[PDB]
Design a protein around this ligand. Sequence first.
Ligand SMILES: *[C@@H](C)[C@H]1/C(=C/c2[nH]c(/C=C3N=C(/C=C4\NC(=O)C(CC)=C4C)C(C)=C\3CCC(=O)O)c(CCC(=O)O)c2C)NC(=O)[C@@H]1C
Ligand SMILES: *[C@@H](C)[C@H]1/C(=C/c2[nH]c(/C=C3N=C(/C=C4\NC(=O)C(CC)=C4C)C(C)=C\3CCC(=O)O)c(CCC(=O)O)c2C)NC(=O)[C@@H]1C
Ligand SMILES: *[C@@H](C)[C@H]1/C(=C/c2[nH]c(/C=C3N=C(/C=C4\NC(=O)C(CC)=C4C)C(C)=C\3CCC(=O)O)c(CCC(=O)O)c2C)NC(=O)[C@@H]1C
Ligand SMILES: *[C@H](C)[C@H]1/C(=C/c2[nH]c(/C=C3N=C(/C=C4\NC(=O)C(CC)=C4C)C(C)=C\3CCC(=O)O)c(CCC(=O)O)c2C)NC(=O)[C@@H]1C
Ligand SMILES: *[C@H](C)[C@H]1/C(=C/c2[nH]c(/C=C3N=C(/C=C4\NC(=O)C(CC)=C4C)C(C)=C\3CCC(=O)O)c(CCC(=O)O)c2C)NC(=O)[C@@H]1C
Ligand SMILES: *[C@H](C)[C@H]1/C(=C/c2[nH]c(/C=C3N=C(/C=C4\NC(=O)C(CC)=C4C)C(C)=C\3CCC(=O)O)c(CCC(=O)O)c2C)NC(=O)[C@@H]1C
Ligand SMILES: *[C@H](C)[C@H]1/C(=C/c2[nH]c(/C=C3N=C(/C=C4\NC(=O)C(CC)=C4C)C(C)=C\3CCC(=O)O)c(CCC(=O)O)c2C)NC(=O)[C@@H]1C
Ligand SMILES: *[C@H](C)[C@H]1/C(=C/c2[nH]c(/C=C3N=C(/C=C4\NC(=O)C(CC)=C4C)C(C)=C\3CCC(=O)O)c(CCC(=O)O)c2C)NC(=O)[C@@H]1C
Ligand SMILES: *[C@H](C)[C@H]1/C(=C/c2[nH]c(/C=C3N=C(/C=C4\NC(=O)C(CC)=C4C)C(C)=C\3CCC(=O)O)c(CCC(=O)O)c2C)NC(=O)[C@@H]1C
Ligand SMILES: *[C@H](C)[C@H]1/C(=C/c2[nH]c(/C=C3N=C(/C=C4\NC(=O)C(CC)=C4C)C(C)=C\3CCC(=O)O)c(CCC(=O)O)c2C)NC(=O)[C@@H]1C
Ligand SMILES: *[C@H](C)[C@H]1/C(=C/c2[nH]c(/C=C3N=C(/C=C4\NC(=O)C(CC)=C4C)C(C)=C\3CCC(=O)O)c(CCC(=O)O)c2C)NC(=O)[C@@H]1C
Ligand SMILES: *[C@H](C)[C@H]1/C(=C/c2[nH]c(/C=C3N=C(/C=C4\NC(=O)C(CC)=C4C)C(C)=C\3CCC(=O)O)c(CCC(=O)O)c2C)NC(=O)[C@@H]1C
Ligand SMILES: *[C@H](C)[C@H]1/C(=C/c2[nH]c(/C=C3N=C(/C=C4\NC(=O)C(CC)=C4C)C(C)=C\3CCC(=O)O)c(CCC(=O)O)c2C)NC(=O)[C@@H]1C
Lengths: 266, 162, 162, 172, 172, 172, 289
Amino acid sequence: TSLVSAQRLGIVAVDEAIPLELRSRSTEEEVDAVILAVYRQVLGNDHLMSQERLTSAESLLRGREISVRDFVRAVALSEVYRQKFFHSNPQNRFIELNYKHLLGRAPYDQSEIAFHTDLYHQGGYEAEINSYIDSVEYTENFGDWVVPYFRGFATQRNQKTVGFSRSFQVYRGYATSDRSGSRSRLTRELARNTASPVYAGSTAESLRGTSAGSRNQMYRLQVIQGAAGTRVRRGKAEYLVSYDNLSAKLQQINRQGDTVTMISLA
Amino acid sequence: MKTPLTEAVSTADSQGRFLSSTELQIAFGRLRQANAGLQAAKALTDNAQSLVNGAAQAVYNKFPYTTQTQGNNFAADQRGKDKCARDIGYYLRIVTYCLVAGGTGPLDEYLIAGIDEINRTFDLSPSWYVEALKYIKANHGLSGDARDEANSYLDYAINALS
Amino acid sequence: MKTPLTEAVSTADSQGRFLSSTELQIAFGRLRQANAGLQAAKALTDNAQSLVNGAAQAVYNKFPYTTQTQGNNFAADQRGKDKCARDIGYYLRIVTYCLVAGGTGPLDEYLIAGIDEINRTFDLSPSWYVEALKYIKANHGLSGDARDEANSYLDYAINALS
Amino acid sequence: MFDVFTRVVSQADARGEYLSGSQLDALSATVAEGNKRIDSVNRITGNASAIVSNAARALFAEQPQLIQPGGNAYTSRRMAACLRDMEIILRYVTYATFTGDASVLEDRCLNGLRETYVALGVPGASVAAGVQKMKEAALDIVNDPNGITRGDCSAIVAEIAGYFDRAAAAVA
Amino acid sequence: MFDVFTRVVSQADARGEYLSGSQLDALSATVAEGNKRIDSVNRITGNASAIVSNAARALFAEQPQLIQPGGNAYTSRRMAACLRDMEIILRYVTYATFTGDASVLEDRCLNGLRETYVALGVPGASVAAGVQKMKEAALDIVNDPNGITRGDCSAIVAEIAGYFDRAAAAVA
Amino acid sequence: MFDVFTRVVSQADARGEYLSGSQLDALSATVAEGNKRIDSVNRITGNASAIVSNAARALFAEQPQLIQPGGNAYTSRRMAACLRDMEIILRYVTYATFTGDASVLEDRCLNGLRETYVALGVPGASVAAGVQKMKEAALDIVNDPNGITRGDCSAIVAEIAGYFDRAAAAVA
Amino acid sequence: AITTAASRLGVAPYNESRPVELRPDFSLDDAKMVIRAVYRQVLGNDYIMDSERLKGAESLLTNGSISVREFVRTVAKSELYKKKFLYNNFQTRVIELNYKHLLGRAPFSEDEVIFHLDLYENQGFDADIDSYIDSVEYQENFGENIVPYYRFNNQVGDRTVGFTRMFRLYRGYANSDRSQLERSSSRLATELGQNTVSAIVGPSGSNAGWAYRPSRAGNTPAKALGGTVPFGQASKLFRVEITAISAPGYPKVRRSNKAVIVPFEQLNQTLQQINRLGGKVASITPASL
Ligand SMILES: *[C@@H](C)[C@H]1/C(=C/c2[nH]c(/C=C3N=C(/C=C4\NC(=O)C(CC)=C4C)C(C)=C\3CCC(=O)O)c(CCC(=O)O)c2C)NC(=O)[C@@H]1C
Ligand SMILES: *[C@@H](C)[C@H]1/C(=C/c2[nH]c(/C=C3N=C(/C=C4\NC(=O)C(CC)=C4C)C(C)=C\3CCC(=O)O)c(CCC(=O)O)c2C)NC(=O)[C@@H]1C
Ligand SMILES: *[C@@H](C)[C@H]1/C(=C/c2[nH]c(/C=C3N=C(/C=C4\NC(=O)C(CC)=C4C)C(C)=C\3CCC(=O)O)c(CCC(=O)O)c2C)NC(=O)[C@@H]1C
Ligand SMILES: *[C@H](C)[C@H]1/C(=C/c2[nH]c(/C=C3N=C(/C=C4\NC(=O)C(CC)=C4C)C(C)=C\3CCC(=O)O)c(CCC(=O)O)c2C)NC(=O)[C@@H]1C
Ligand SMILES: *[C@H](C)[C@H]1/C(=C/c2[nH]c(/C=C3N=C(/C=C4\NC(=O)C(CC)=C4C)C(C)=C\3CCC(=O)O)c(CCC(=O)O)c2C)NC(=O)[C@@H]1C
Ligand SMILES: *[C@H](C)[C@H]1/C(=C/c2[nH]c(/C=C3N=C(/C=C4\NC(=O)C(CC)=C4C)C(C)=C\3CCC(=O)O)c(CCC(=O)O)c2C)NC(=O)[C@@H]1C
Ligand SMILES: *[C@H](C)[C@H]1/C(=C/c2[nH]c(/C=C3N=C(/C=C4\NC(=O)C(CC)=C4C)C(C)=C\3CCC(=O)O)c(CCC(=O)O)c2C)NC(=O)[C@@H]1C
Ligand SMILES: *[C@H](C)[C@H]1/C(=C/c2[nH]c(/C=C3N=C(/C=C4\NC(=O)C(CC)=C4C)C(C)=C\3CCC(=O)O)c(CCC(=O)O)c2C)NC(=O)[C@@H]1C
Ligand SMILES: *[C@H](C)[C@H]1/C(=C/c2[nH]c(/C=C3N=C(/C=C4\NC(=O)C(CC)=C4C)C(C)=C\3CCC(=O)O)c(CCC(=O)O)c2C)NC(=O)[C@@H]1C
Ligand SMILES: *[C@H](C)[C@H]1/C(=C/c2[nH]c(/C=C3N=C(/C=C4\NC(=O)C(CC)=C4C)C(C)=C\3CCC(=O)O)c(CCC(=O)O)c2C)NC(=O)[C@@H]1C
Ligand SMILES: *[C@H](C)[C@H]1/C(=C/c2[nH]c(/C=C3N=C(/C=C4\NC(=O)C(CC)=C4C)C(C)=C\3CCC(=O)O)c(CCC(=O)O)c2C)NC(=O)[C@@H]1C
Ligand SMILES: *[C@H](C)[C@H]1/C(=C/c2[nH]c(/C=C3N=C(/C=C4\NC(=O)C(CC)=C4C)C(C)=C\3CCC(=O)O)c(CCC(=O)O)c2C)NC(=O)[C@@H]1C
Ligand SMILES: *[C@H](C)[C@H]1/C(=C/c2[nH]c(/C=C3N=C(/C=C4\NC(=O)C(CC)=C4C)C(C)=C\3CCC(=O)O)c(CCC(=O)O)c2C)NC(=O)[C@@H]1C
């Protein structure tokens, strides 16, 4: 997005990112940069140890034996990818990680969760992973030579609006990685076809004045509430409370049977 | 953090008004005290190791059962002695912070709040720490305004513990 | 009533604790200010009559219509001039009270609170009183801490008015 | 609430009069005594816990029926409430000493304390006895000559003593 | 919030370390600057209404679209809200100047202000322009040589400038 | 909220100009329609209980899964909440009819309603069907020619139908 | 509810006053109405000068940065609240004022005095205010978006002792809670300590004997211990509270307020005697049977 929304949302680096294309007759440093970009984006910005590097796959990429898409596929099918994104993760979290790493976006629909779940159950991890890389979406956006990059913050064709909002649930910042087993943030949002408010970068903070307590910190409590007292006006509720009233607010939410969806510093 | 300046701003902010002459006099009083507080902090810091070791020995002398009775809460072994010296060092360091800050705000935020839950949970006698603070009072060697402000924080800790 | 001593005890009392070194520093600042405040009050008091008359005449010079326009809120007649002199005398006397008290509490409680409703109801412009306060500023002949503290109260009244 | 300056201010404002030269010099005499006032407040505050505990222990020694089973200071909660009141009396006496005016002591602590004690059966005379013990332990702490600049604190000691007697009389 | 002393104290406690000699010396240097800091606070406070009013008049004079009908400063309630906002920013700048730390300005005033302005359609750039007007207006008032002991106030002027620029950056 | 008059006023103030003759004449036409508007509001209000209860019975007869054990309208509390919701929708539709603007129905009833129903598992489509049933019953009530001065109420009925469909669209 | 005696008491203006709720996506009039209601109720109908208005708290409430409950908390924690209700009052009176402002009811028993005084003394005024507002009673009655209001009517967890004490704390619609006869004195210290009640005396408009207040000592007890024996033959005994006794003058009249237990057969004569001394009857309660 433009700068004025980008600084607020903390997506300036994503907006100014340039797609990396491995051209013909590329030099050694270009292949090095392409390999580094693939490792950064497919492995979700983890500190990749040299012992976890795919030496044979990057050799084939260097020697023009395979394309960038094939190297992306080799990294995605690698046991390193399995260990940090599949073997200790629930299936819904795993496929949103696949969507972020391979297509650069958040899941659009619960049917996309229904897909890749049956596909896993019928054809294994390899077929399920190949679905993303062989998809029509991967071909027009990245092709055989462009490193995949995150696209959820920009308006795409055949895109649902929720994708942009849901993007901030899967991209938590430039200095973030997908490293810690964790559950998806999009489960209820995808299942019930909703959208969650975006609280990223500086968007989450709210005015404090003299209303915040001793340590001048407000917390936003997003809860799901029903009538258990006073009339409930909305199913969704947001509560801004100081630190000193955080335990009391939590306990009275608990005794009303209200489900807490999120707590963030505001 | 209870300091003259932060509290002056806080009172003014709840009424939503600019800083008047009252807040300026708070700042003037803080300025009058601050140099003495800074030398008090420097003297305590330079003598910190002997003060902490001497305070620990005074507690071990007054309560000999702490150095000879088995149990996690006592200092009969080296692990317990290290914990004790660490606690007294915590006390001394937060007292120097108070001298720098010009109020009991560091002691309240870092040490005083919740200390009684600590001593109960871990069966630590507050009298031990009172004796350590009394040793520090008697041995810091400060004079004048430095001594008065430092003794105020040390007595504040003593009164909280008793 | 905001003064250093009153504010210090009120902060401590709302926290339900004994006075710490923070409140004592507030008292030290009040002690530093007090003598200049008291002799500024004396100097203003001794020069009060000429200051009030000169401030009133200054308002008449800058705002001539207040002496020609017939109306209850104007000083065209003798009673209007008396009301004006009494009002400026109120401002000067309450400023001395602020000087002896050490804070804006006398101005806040006796004059500032509700003065907007006064001026709106009785059709008195705050600009008139601003010029009266400006004359008092320019002609009180105070120096050092006395002038600083007195001008802060006079500027406090002006800032409240405009 | 009033301090020593605002008390004179309120009296003068009601008469519409500037403070006279005599009143100003009395206030200048008060601020000249200011360091001694700060020392006395500091000395009572630094020994607050010792003052309250020693006075209560002496009080229960001389009045055993307070702590006998069924007495007013018997059970933990009533003992704690007794200890709390002693410390509260002491705190507002220090407040009154700090401001130089007794209004904080009267408005916060003394107005209604007698009525509360009568309503509950708290023996007000025994509370007055405890307050007098706090008095006598605090005046010599203020009057202690060691570790302070020498001078005459008789005026501030008399003023503190008056606050303590006022507290003892409001409850007895 | 922090002031200039407790900011250094909090960093030390996180490190578990006593303040070094250089930090205590730096704190002594800012104690020696305390009189000048109080003068700056006093001078901005004593001119606060003039600073806000002249800055606001200049802002609408150079940005007439704010006060045209339908503009964000149009209608007396929104015009009053804009003036109040100016006074709020300036007041927290004086708070930060008094304390010697931007924590009060950042935590209590600036945090979430941009979100509020964006959500309301308050143009943060013109709010930043208005804060920039209060900036040199207050800096010239702090630097006015008349009726004060002469001395170099360059450090405190730079610090107040930083608080003003910090507020301007947050709103824009 | 807004009514028909204040909506035009708010638009004119944002554009900062007097209402033109066409807008004033349009509001005059609205005033002429006012008696029929009051009639329609009164007619729906008088039959409010019948409209809500009959529509609920019709909804549960054609959607038995709502009232089967485990259905979202099963048990007494949830059935009472469902009847309360039908009543709430009808009442705010009458509010919108009375004002002549849809702001009250939107601002106070429909905004967040979809998100409430999804979050608690209320089937919004079934709420929409009940809303459609109340709409046909209420419009039959409004267009009833018995015991009223005959005139053309087509405009107000179309306006009422729009409020009802806005409600049925908002839930699902 | 209170129907016949609503105007006599000050309950009638609150009978048709609905609770002030800030709905989600509220308008500007809604925010201002909440500000007015909070100022009136939390500050106890004191006039609020413009210099005393909490501009920042109002702005935050208007913006939705804080809720109604958080705004009530900010007002209750303000220096404005503390000058009006904390700094010049015995802490039992502060507790009485907190219950009236933040909960809209009188204290029920001495246990509440114990809890709040202990919490104030151990953790300060701000922590004490939080306990009123984070209480289960506040959440069930007002919640997050409703301005606290006087709870005159009977509720689920009420005690009738609280209903009687409500009129010791509330003295009419045109009354300001700092402009009452007892001034800064605690109204319920004796009453909470002894678990007793006083006969309800209505406000000054509709009740001639409104000014009656018992003295420190020498008060006639509520019930007639002894029955009819000191009065010869009598059917029933009644306690009559009389105020504004002045006609005979000092030394014949010492206290202008007097409570007398009189038999039924002397009630007529008692009324004439009150009329000669210029007194006003505050209340008459059955004292026997
Ligand atoms: C830059 C800010 C300007 C400046 C400042 C400056 N001030 C002083 C010294 C003093 N200023 C005060 C202030 C006050 N005294 C009061 O009673 C009040 C009201 C509460 C105030 C605000 C004081 C006490 C002093 C010290 C004594 C004296 O008056 O000289 C200095 C001198 C050096 C010092 O810091 O002490 C300076 C430099 N000077 C300029 O030229 C700038 C325009
Ligand atoms: C009767 C109360 C006793 C007594 C007191 C006394 N004190 C002073 C002078 C000073 N004492 C202080 C105090 C403090 N400085 C600090 O930094 C702190 C902590 C915040 C405190 C409490 C100060 C600043 C002074 C002035 C400097 C000095 O040492 O003189 C005096 C001297 C007279 C004066 O008013 O200055 C006296 C008499 N003396 C006794 O003998 C009593 C037992
Ligand atoms: C469509 C809505 C139906 C309809 C309406 C209609 N009404 C009138 C005229 C009037 N209706 C009223 C209404 C009331 N008077 C009362 O006292 C109350 C109770 C509080 C109400 C609701 C009034 C005052 C009038 C004017 C006098 C009159 O009764 O004739 C009209 C006539 C045109 C007009 O707008 O005045 C119409 C058309 N008529 C239908 O056929 C629809 C079924
Ligand atoms: C024009 C009337 C108003 C306006 C618009 C505006 N929108 C954006 C940015 C985005 N718009 C969308 C929306 C969609 N993307 C989709 O794919 C779909 C269809 C399913 C929709 C509805 C999104 C997601 C964005 C962000 C990503 C992108 O910009 O591509 C902007 C740019 C914001 C920025 O800072 O760059 C603008 C300006 N702005 C106004 O002021 C008008 C009132
Ligand atoms: C060292 C001083 C301390 C420490 C560090 C530590 N960090 C991690 C893990 C990560 N570090 C980062 C940070 C970045 N990655 C980037 O690309 C950027 C530039 C924008 C930054 C700042 C990230 C994202 C991670 C996540 C994991 C990853 O592998 O990338 C670890 C590893 C934790 C773990 O293995 O579970 C550690 C140990 N740890 C200490 O104890 C020191 C105080
Ligand atoms: C020394 C005077 C006596 C003594 C000490 C002792 N302390 C502990 C354990 C703890 N001490 C603390 C205290 C603090 N932690 C903090 O962070 C601070 C504030 C900055 C303080 C004052 C705590 C929290 C503990 C328990 C957890 C921990 O181990 O840190 C022990 C060990 C008790 C146990 O059960 O492990 C001991 C022995 N012991 C003596 O005999 C001395 C007389
Ligand atoms: C015995 C295990 C150890 C011991 C006892 C000891 N206790 C005190 C003093 C007090 N004890 C209490 C306790 C209670 N009072 C109650 O009403 C109840 C609840 C029903 C309890 C548990 C209190 C309040 C006191 C102080 C007041 C009093 O004098 O009673 C002392 C004397 C302490 C003093 O300073 O006077 C002693 C000696 N001492 C040991 O050494 C044993 C290991
Ligand atoms: C101790 C020396 C004597 C003693 C004390 C005692 N007090 C209570 C109870 C209360 N004390 C108060 C006091 C105050 N309220 C305030 O507002 C202020 C400060 C501004 C004060 C000092 C109150 C209101 C109570 C009631 C609440 C409570 O019980 O805590 C008790 C308990 C009475 C009972 O029977 O519950 C006691 C024991 N008692 C003695 O015997 C000593 C002589
Ligand atoms: C003036 C230079 C510009 C301007 C201002 C403007 N602001 C608002 C509204 C609000 N301002 C705030 C800010 C604060 N409230 C606080 O308590 C504090 C301290 C923490 C701050 C900084 C808030 C919360 C609001 C919203 C609530 C309220 O209205 O009070 C408005 C009104 C917007 C509206 O539509 O109502 C305006 C006009 N507008 C300009 O055009 C100037 C450039
Ligand atoms: C009936 C046609 C359908 C149905 C209804 C149903 N609704 C709820 C719960 C709520 N309904 C609302 C809606 C409103 N409350 C308001 O105050 C406003 C007006 C301002 C509206 C529009 C809300 C907020 C709730 C939640 C709080 C509450 O439960 O009262 C339920 C209860 C769901 C539960 O289990 O808690 C039900 C049953 N259910 C059906 O099956 C029908 C299709
Ligand atoms: C019925 C047998 C007689 C009768 C009763 C009657 N009572 C009231 C009003 C109230 N009743 C109470 C009583 C209580 N409140 C409590 O909290 C408790 C339980 C802990 C009790 C026992 C109160 C306080 C009221 C007034 C407040 C309220 O009603 O909400 C009325 C109504 C009077 C009026 O409307 O003014 C009535 C009618 N009346 C008879 O004639 C019967 C003999
Ligand atoms: C003016 C002609 C006379 C005068 C008046 C005066 N009144 C007060 C204080 C209050 N006045 C009221 C009255 C009302 N408040 C209401 O809400 C209602 C309507 C239901 C009425 C009639 C109240 C309750 C107060 C107290 C609240 C407050 O904030 O004071 C004062 C102030 C007294 C004081 O500040 O001490 C004054 C001055 N005074 C005169 O001399 C005129 C004869
Ligand atoms: C004079 C400074 C103020 C004043 C006085 C005033 N008082 C009354 C009437 C009475 N005063 C009393 C008082 C007492 N009864 C006692 O037992 C004692 C203590 C032993 C006293 C002092 C009584 C009983 C009355 C009523 C009967 C009587 O008048 O004798 C009045 C007359 C009021 C009336 O309505 O007649 C007045 C004027 N008035 C002021 O304004 C002064 C501030």
